[PDB]
């Protein structure tokens, strides 16, 4: 019944010959520069672990640490602070260059090695019997920034990663301030890289990225800015100018940001969260806002292939980009379902409905 | 019927996964359920014992001299270990066929450790490495046994596939129109039917094993089902491989049950009559089938283990062999425990 559809029915589905294989629940928020909710899928206020999609907020805490400007981090270094990188040789080399700028050593890092986020990098490592170390962490740039901040304020590099350290107090405050939340409305766990990681309502992740893009618009327009808005504009610019540092060759985030050529930034979180900050455009005005836009997505069950398909679908439904810009992402939008003998066996479909119908149809967030 | 397995990071919900499960008696009557026990479901590799039955019921196949380990490989989603490829080649030699006759293709191994070994050695898998290679050699054997020709043995209009289609519907106790068909990753037809009927197939496998052990008069079909059960339970390493759930589950239970994975996170178990089954309120064998709605395999194995604990199947000591699958490791890159898995579902009876 098309006239009784509900947020509880917002799915992405895979089929085999038209027979349902898997279904995945989708949650999404689309917000304006003040965080007002414009569009939604599923539960746009779902309490959600932002994971690596929080990294621009952690980069802001680093860049707002007094004395950090003195180390001479450049835009590619800031983009690495914002990264879940593929551990390509260029990412490891930049991590070592950043450690040299702060006179620190790989032994000061409190992140650990893991298999690469890139299948091709991981194949190179397997071929050479290479065991990844701390410097190879997808979060290595964030950790070097946290060490830089610790040294800058004279707090000591020992325990920079623990909640009692002032660098983590700064991160905690900065995340809550960008979300416009009380500290008690942000929950904290521990991440794969061994830092504190926040959880907050999904719409507030959209709000962070709307603030990033709004700051970029203010900077480009030559508006007078707070130190905080200038730092946010710098983070947006660094991610957009160096998208290969944010992820790497063949990665969604890098391909998305190269396709859009400065119009937006986007970032993956582990367990299938995504956030995008969109600069004011004809598309944002058509959506009914006079400023920048933020988008956040979660796939309930954590599937990354589905996340990238949904994010690309939602950009198409919001009219963000042109068909020609979005076509660079076609392999992610409609993932290949081809068997071991080259036969197409199925596909992906998007039985979800954006909401902004009878007044009597309740839209219960689910 | 809103039944989930949930993962957390420091008590904060990370992912949640919808669970469907059916527990059935030997006639397919529903005893217990999670979610929607009649969900239309692609059985994928969990249909393999029904396809093995079609092969074993083909006139002339007994002549090739397949042994129990060969039948276990017909029932397998194997890890493509060197021992699986060697048994595939031995089975091809028993039917005087060659790897070129197979119409399945190579894929990355279902074992990360095997796959890493292949990457290290620049090895490109071929048809003989397919997880389905044993099923394909059996389908070639059945085609050659009835003189149907090996060309197109995998196509729906080949008599081997008409035999498979009918045999699946018969074991489900469904009309042909109630079973849907797609194409699998190995390029064979693959069925979909209500989840409880996957449990019914496995209840029939275990019931057949009980009837055989008891010296009951059996149809050729019940004798063949008993043989398939015995082959899987005797050679569980052929069904999957080192470290795989299916192999560890069947070794732990030492003949008391068989279990099999389907791709995209289905699972089926056939349980021989026991003190546990009698306590659950049935006088015969039982079948269990599970689907994780979103396809997550780590969650499937956690749920299946949890369900065996809820049903009292095995002893605590037997089920402790599966502890790493029951409560999967949530340890970060620096050895710190960050989270875990919870089962906020309730079996309904
Ligand atoms: Cl590149
Ligand atoms: Zn991290
Ligand atoms: Zn197969």
Author numbering:
A (entry chain AAA): -3 to 352, 358 to 367
B (entry chain BBB): 4 to 352
Task: Please give sentences taken from the publication describing this entry.
The orthorhombic (OP) and monoclinic MP1/MP2 forms show similar packing pattern with solvent content of 49.4–52.6%, whereas the monoclinic form MC, with a significantly different arrangement of the dimers in the unit cell, has 53.2% solvent content. In the close vicinity of the Ser48 hydroxyl, there is a characteristic, almost tetrahedral pattern of three closely-spaced water molecules w2, w3, w4, visible in all crystal structures, except MP2. These waters must have extremely strong H-bonds with the Oγ atom of Ser48, as indicated by the O···O distances, which in the highest-resolution structure OP refined to 2.2–2.5 Å. The water molecules are also tightly H-bonded to each other. Water w3 is also H-bonded to w1 coordinated by the Zn2+ cation. The attraction of the three water molecules w2-w3-w4 by the Ser48 side chain is a clear evidence of this polarization. In the absence of a substrate, the arrangement of w2-w3-w4 might mimic the tetrahedral transition state of the catalytic event.
